[PDB]
Each structure stands twice: as C-alpha cells, then as structure tokens.
Amino acid sequence: MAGNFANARVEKLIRQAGAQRVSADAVDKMNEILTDWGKNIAKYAVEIARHSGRKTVKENDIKLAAQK
Amino acid sequence: MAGNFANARVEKLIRQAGAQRVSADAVDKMNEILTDWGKNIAKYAVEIARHSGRKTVKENDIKLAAQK
Amino acid sequence: MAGNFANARVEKLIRQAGAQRVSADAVDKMNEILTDWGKNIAKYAVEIARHSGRKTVKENDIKLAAQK
Amino acid sequence: MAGNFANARVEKLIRQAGAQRVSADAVDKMNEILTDWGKNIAKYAVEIARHSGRKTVKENDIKLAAQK
Amino acid sequence: MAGNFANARVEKLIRQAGAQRVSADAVDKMNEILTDWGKNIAKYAVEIARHSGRKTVKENDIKLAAQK
Amino acid sequence: MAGNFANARVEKLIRQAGAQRVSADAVDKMNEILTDWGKNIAKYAVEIARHSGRKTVKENDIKLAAQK
Amino acid sequence: MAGNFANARVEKLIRQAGAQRVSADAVDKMNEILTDWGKNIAKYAVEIARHSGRKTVKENDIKLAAQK
Amino acid sequence: MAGNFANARVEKLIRQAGAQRVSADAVDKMNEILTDWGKNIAKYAVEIARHSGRKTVKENDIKLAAQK
DNA sequence: GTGCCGAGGCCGCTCAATTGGTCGTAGACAGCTCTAGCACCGCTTAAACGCACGTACGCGCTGTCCCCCGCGTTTTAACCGCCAAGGGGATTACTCCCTAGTCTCCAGGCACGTGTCAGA
DNA sequence: TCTGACACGTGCCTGGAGACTAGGGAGTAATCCCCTTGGCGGTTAAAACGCGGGGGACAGCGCGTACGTGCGTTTAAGCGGTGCTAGAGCTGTCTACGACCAATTGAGCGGCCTCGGCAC
Numbered sequence: 083m084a085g086n087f088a089n090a091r092v093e094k095l096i097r098q099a100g101a102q103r104v105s106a107d108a109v110d111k112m113n114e115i116l117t118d119w120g121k122n123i124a125k126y127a128v129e130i131a132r133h134s135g136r137k138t139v140k141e142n143d144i145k146l147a148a149q150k
Numbered sequence: 151m152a153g154n155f156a157n158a159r160v161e162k163l164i165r166q167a168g169a170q171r172v173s174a175d176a177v178d179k180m181n182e183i184l185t186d187w188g189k190n191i192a193k194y195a196v197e198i199a200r201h202s203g204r205k206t207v208k209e210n211d212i213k214l215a216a217q218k
Numbered sequence: 219m220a221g222n223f224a225n226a227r228v229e230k231l232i233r234q235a236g237a238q239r240v241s242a243d244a245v246d247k248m249n250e251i252l253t254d255w256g257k258n259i260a261k262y263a264v265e266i267a268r269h270s271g272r273k274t275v276k277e278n279d280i281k282l283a284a285q286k
Numbered sequence: 287m288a289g290n291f292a293n294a295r296v297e298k299l300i301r302q303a304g305a306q307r308v309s310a311d312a313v314d315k316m317n318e319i320l321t322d323w324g325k326n327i328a329k330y331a332v333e334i335a336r337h338s339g340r341k342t343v344k345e346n347d348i349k350l351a352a353q354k
Numbered sequence: 355m356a357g358n359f360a361n362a363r364v365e366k367l368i369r370q371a372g373a374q375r376v377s378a379d380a381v382d383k384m385n386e387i388l389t390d391w392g393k394n395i396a397k398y399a400v401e402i403a404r405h406s407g408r409k410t411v412k413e414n415d416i417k418l419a420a421q422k
Numbered sequence: 423m424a425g426n427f428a429n430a431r432v433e434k435l436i437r438q439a440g441a442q443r444v445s446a447d448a449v450d451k452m453n454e455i456l457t458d459w460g461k462n463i464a465k466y467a468v469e470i471a472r473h474s475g476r477k478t479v480k481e482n483d484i485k486l487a488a489q490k
Numbered sequence: 491m492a493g494n495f496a497n498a499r500v501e502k503l504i505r506q507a508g509a510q511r512v513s514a515d516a517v518d519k520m521n522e523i524l525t526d527w528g529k530n531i532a533k534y535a536v537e538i539a540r541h542s543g544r545k546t547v548k549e550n551d552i553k554l555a556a557q558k
Numbered sequence: 559m560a561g562n563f564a565n566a567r568v569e570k571l572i573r574q575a576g577a578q579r580v581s582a583d584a585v586d587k588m589n590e591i592l593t594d595w596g597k598n599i600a601k602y603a604v605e606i607a608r609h610s611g612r613k614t615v616k617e618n619d620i621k622l623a624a625q626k
Numbered sequence: 627g628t629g630c631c632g633a634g635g636c637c638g639c640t641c642a643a644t645t646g647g648t649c650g651t652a653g654a655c656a657g658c659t660c661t662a663g664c665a666c667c668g669c670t671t672a673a674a675c676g677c678a679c680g681t682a683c684g685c686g687c688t689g690t691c692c693c694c695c696g697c698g699t700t701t702t703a704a705c706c707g708c709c710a711a712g713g714g715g716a717t718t719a720c721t722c723c724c725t726a727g728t729c730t731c732c733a734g735g736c737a738c739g740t741g742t743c744a745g746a
Numbered sequence: 747t748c749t750g751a752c753a754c755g756t757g758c759c760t761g762g763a764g765a766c767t768a769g770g771g772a773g774t775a776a777t778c779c780c781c782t783t784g785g786c787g788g789t790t791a792a793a794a795c796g797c798g799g800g801g802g803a804c805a806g807c808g809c810g811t812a813c814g815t816g817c818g819t820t821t822a823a824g825c826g827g828t829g830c831t832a833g834a835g836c837t838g839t840c841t842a843c844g845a846c847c848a849a850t851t852g853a854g855c856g857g858c859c860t861c862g863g864c865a866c
Contacts, residue, residue: 086163087155088831090665095154095185096207099192101199103674103822107209108195115191115216116184117163123183124167127176131169133541133554137841138171138655139164144179146541156664158832171841173654201269201282204675206822214269222299223291223320226695231290231321232343235328237335239342239704239792244331247348251327252291252320253299259319260303263312267305272812274307274685275300280315292694294802307685307811337405337418341704342792350405355726358435359427360772362725367426367457368479371464373471375734378762379481380467387488388460389435395452396439403441409781410715411436413447420455428724430772443715443781476735478762493592494571495563498862503562503593504615507600509607511614516603519620524596525571531591532575535584539577546579546644546852547572552587564861566635579644579852 085113092116123147153181160184191215220246221253228252259283289317296320327351357385364388395419425453432456463487492522500524531555561589568592602626 085092089106092113096104127147131139153160157174160181164172194215199207219225225242228249232240260275263283267275289296293310296317300308330351335343355361364385368376396411399419403411423429433449464479466487471479491497501517509516535555539547561568565582568589572580600615603623607615 095188096192100196101207103206105206105208108207108212111209111212120163124164128168130541133538139169139176140173141175141179144176198269201266231324232328236332237343241344243345244343244348247345251352256299260300264304274309275305275312276309277311277315280312284319334405337402367460368464372468373479375478377480380479380484383481383484392435396436400440410443411441411448412445413451416448416451494567504600507597508604509615513614513616515617516615516620519617523624524592547577547584548581549583549587552584
C-alpha cells in the first residue's frame, strides 16, 4: 500500500463520479496517483512557507503550492 | 466538509512532506484540492469505461484518465 | 488557408441561411470557426475509438463526441 | 446529401485529428453535424446583418454569431 | 414579489379575462411567467439595439424581439 | 395607456435587462405585448377552471394555460 | 548571446578553464548553456523573494535558488 | 571580481527575469555561481576536445561537456 | 587575427523605502484522552470480462475523369463617415393616485362515502 | 363483454372575499444637451462572368478488421463482523501578526576611463 488515503474513501469518490462497478486495481492506482500529486503539492508548500519564514504551512501556502 | 478524504490522513501527508506545523485551514484546503482533481480523474475514468463497453472501472482507465 | 472546407462551399451555406451579400472576410471567419469545432469533435472522436479498442472511427464515435 | 461540405474534405479533418481509419458513415455524420452548426451560426449571422441595417454579412457578424 | 409587475394589476388582468374568482398563488404564478417572458423579450431587444448601433431601445426593437 | 401594467414597472424591467436608455414608445409596445400574451394565458386558465369545476382560477390553471 | 555576460568574457573563461584553442561557435554555445541555467536560477530566486515577502533579491535568494 | 562576467550584465539578467530590485551582493553571488557552472562545462569540454583529438574546442565539445 | 573606437561596467553621493530589528500581543494550535465509528479484512455467488474462433462487411488502393471553384477583373452598389439640426430621454421635484397590508366577515373548495356504467 | 373507473352526497375547511387605509411611488411638466437621423460623398467593397484544372465522388478488387457468440475464468458485490483510527475538543504556550523606527542598499542621474565588438 504505497498510497496514504483510505482505500474505501477513494472508492467512494469513483462511485460518486458514476461508476457502476469499481475494481480494486482502480482504487489502488487512484490512491497512488492522488498520493503522488499530494506529496508534490505538500513539498512545494513546505518550501513556500520556509521562504516566507513561517514555521507553519497555511492555506495560502497550499493555494500557492497548487498552480505550480 | 468540501473534501472526501479524512482530514487526519491529508494532514499526515503534509507532515510527511516535511512541514513542522500545519494549520487546519491548510489541511481543509489541501483536501479540497485533492478531491477536485480526484473527481476530474474519476469522471474521465467512468467515461473511459463506458466508451470501452465495460461496466467495471479498471486500472488502465485510471492511468489513461490521469495521463491526459 | 485557415480551415479545411472549401470557401465556395462555406459561402453557399451562408447564402442559403438567407444573406443577400457575403463578404470574403465573413467566409474565412466561418471556415475557421467550422474547422476549429470540427477538429475538437474529431480529436475527441479518435479518443472514443482508441478507448473502445476499435481502430476505425464509426458513426457512434462522432455522435458521442458531438453531444459534449 | 443532408450535409453540405465535401465528404473527402471532412474525412481529411478526421484523419488529421489522428484516426487510423474513418468509416464512410462517420464522414456522413460529421458532415451533417458541421452543416447543422454552420446553419445555426449563419441564420444568427444573417439576423445580425438585418438588425444592423447592413445588407452584407461581414467578419464581425460571424464573430458575434459564434458567441451563441 | 418574484415577478416585477404589480400583483393587484396582474390580478386585474386575470379577472378582466373572465375569471369569476382568483387564487393569490395564481396571481404570483402569472406575475412570474410574465416577468420571465418579459426578460426574454427585453434581453433580445437590448441586443437588437446593440447590433443596430444605438444606445436607446426603440419601439421597433420590441416588435422584432417579439416575432422570435 | 395601451396596456394593463404600470409603465414605470415595464420600463424598469427593460433597464434591468441591460438597456442603456429606454424609449417611451418601447415601454408602450412592451406593455401592450405583455398585456396581450397575459390575456391569452388568462383566457386558457379560465377555460381550464371551467373544465376543473373549481370556479376560483388556481395556481395550477395558470401553469397549464402557459403550457397550452 | 544566450547569457548576459560579454562573449569575449565567456571565451576568456573557457580558455582559462583549460581550452588550448576555442572556436567562436563553442563560445556562443557555452554562453547559451550558462544563460539557460541562469534563467532557471533567476525564476526560482524571484519566487524565493515573493514567498519571503521581500521586494529586493539578496545573497540569500541566490543561495536558496541554487541549492533547490 | 567574484565572477568573470560583467556585473551590470548579470544584474540586467536578474532584472529581465522580473526582479522588483536586484541587490549588488546578490549580483556578485550570481556572477560567482554562473562562473563556477560555466567553468565545470568548460573543463568537461576540454576533456572531450582531448578525447576527440581536435585541439580547438568546437560547439559539439561544449554540448557534450554540459551533458557530462 | 588584428588595431581602435564608441559605448557601458563600474564609481560617487544620494534620498528614503527597505531592511532590518524588539516587544507586545492574539488566535492559533500540538498533545493528550477516549468514544464511536468507517473500515478492510472475511467469505459466497454468480455476473461480467477476456479469450478463440468463424464470418461477412466495409474499409482500404487504385484508378478516373469531369464536377466544381478559385482566382482575376470588370462594373458599381452598400456602407463608412461626417457634420448640422433636429427629437426626445435623463433629469427632478411634486402631488395625488393605488396598492400591498390587514383587518375580519363571509360562502366557495377538498376528503370520504358509495352507488352506477355497460354488452360484437 | 367484463371490469374497476366513474359520479354525486354530504360534512369540514381556509381561503380571497370584502372594508379602509396612508404613504410609496407611478405619472406628470421643463429643459437641457446628447444621441439619431440624414444627406452628400467618396471609397470599400461584393457580384457576374468566363477559364482550367485541381481534386472530390465513383467504380471494382481484395483482405483485415469487428462483430458475435460460446464458455470458462476471475472477479466485484453483496454484508457479517473485529477492530484499528479519525475526531472532538480541553488545555498550555508559542509562532504569526503587527508597529515602532534604526541602518542603510538599492533607486536615480550621469560621467570616468576600461574593454567587446566591427572591418574584413
């Protein structure tokens, strides 16, 4: 399990999109893709915060970490 | 809440990225951004499955949806 | 030229709509608008074919591409 | 034909979009869709000419019609 | 009021048409329907003036907006 | 006055649609056309009330008359 | 050329670096390579200043842009 | 000087990147860093020239040295 | 590869917005307890999905050839454009009309009950 | 020709039916000035016309995909159930934010005298 999110909560996202059936391989690939894109946003947010001088990552740092 | 993921699980990802302190507003904003990108991948993946003539969303459908 | 369709054939479509007179700049802008919308339908229809596994773009692939 | 444009010129647009093969039934449906959308832009364009009191349809009339 | 017109005036029109008695909900529904159709005529009339190259909406613009 | 509604209220509706200036003849033509279309809806609502047996024109009778 | 520094100075660096002889095309190619790396450093340094909330890029901005 | 390149030209590069202000000290550090990176490329280019047999460093030697 | 020339990299205060600080101060959270979950396992089950095979249908490629159509170029009809002189809409203050509000007395709707239609 | 949809018959309901406001705002008269025609005019153009010829629509051959479908394999959806986690949130204390205001680097003009092209 390389993905951080709860498998069932990722599955619920794909069923809410409209899927009639969702396979375990699609839940695990989705969890892995959302964990990877998350870790890219998080690392850039930590860097933005440090450049600013705050020890705390805030909403602006995440919004500014997205749109990279 | 605006995002589907568990706040503690999104926060855990931001700390793992390197952040020493994380504002709840950063966790909620991060969760909202991952949910939106997830719902776009899932809606495109459901559409790939429907076009394939297959009812079950599979691994290749998440890969193809995330690639473009 | 800016678009694929024949200028005289795009002009014929504007005169059949009712125009008493048509300026060549209006024929070119119409040809450009119909090519641009055409390439958006054809690209999405080639995706619908590739997703189906089929190689030839069939009538249903154009119908499904146009309803979006 | 119900479609107005030259079939081979509509086919060329689908092969340039990327199709490895194009069915004669997909050429006909594409020609019909581009003719219908063309006639709606052209009926709206001949209209903007009569409102303006100008007898000749010009670039601005097609540009303003395409915003519908 | 959901519609723009005077409720007492909307009711006076329904009674004048022949209705022996009138529901207050019938008055509000009539006012809403007349306001929607009114906004459609006015939006298209403002466009007729704009395309005509005039700032003032004139009588003919309401006539042309009503015929379509 | 040519129509049953308040002239200032008709004018206000045209300004709310976006008109930069509104001619007094546009107000009178708008009041006349909204009076006539309203009287047609009311005539069918009175017919539907007679067919319903309830003499008090009801909110449903207006909806059915507009849907004539 | 590709870099901001004078071609004569870029060539002088290559000869001082150890070049027994230096072609004019080698000087231009070196200047272009240094300019590309410099543009990457400059873009990251400007971002560093914006995140820190300082209008003036300082020695620290260059250090932070160089290590990451 | 801390770098072989013209300080004014290094500062001009930072300003061209969009800097609101470029500190003279940041200019010296930038010139030093561009000098070092350029010297590394030049050293590899001289090694590639020795291996090629041609004593005069050519454009290809610079490309291979930057790709070291 | 070689010698001069014509800028321009680097000096010089300058003036002040920028770059530093220290202290006060506020709304934050980390750190912990501990309840009530979503849950990720566990079977079953039987519903797709993938894979093979045989068939036929409709795309390719190759002609093919004359139906369109894209240029010129001539003639001249709309359409910008522009410059008075007109009409008529924004403006406002005002006065008296109407109308949502609402008091509140008054007879037309809406369930349940239940009997009637109707025969080639 | 049968079926169960269709009609009165009371009894209970709340809904526009009326009054009279009473002041909000819908017409009204002036006048100022800015759009709107509107006319001559000049240029920008579209429309007719005839020419060649590029290339779009057929024809038949042939062969490779697409379909359909028989069946066997591999599952995802049931949901029953043990539990490991998310969260709520009470608390202590600190990391933002903020403003006071000290030092001074970088804007700013501009010119001294050092060095990358130009010419070929």
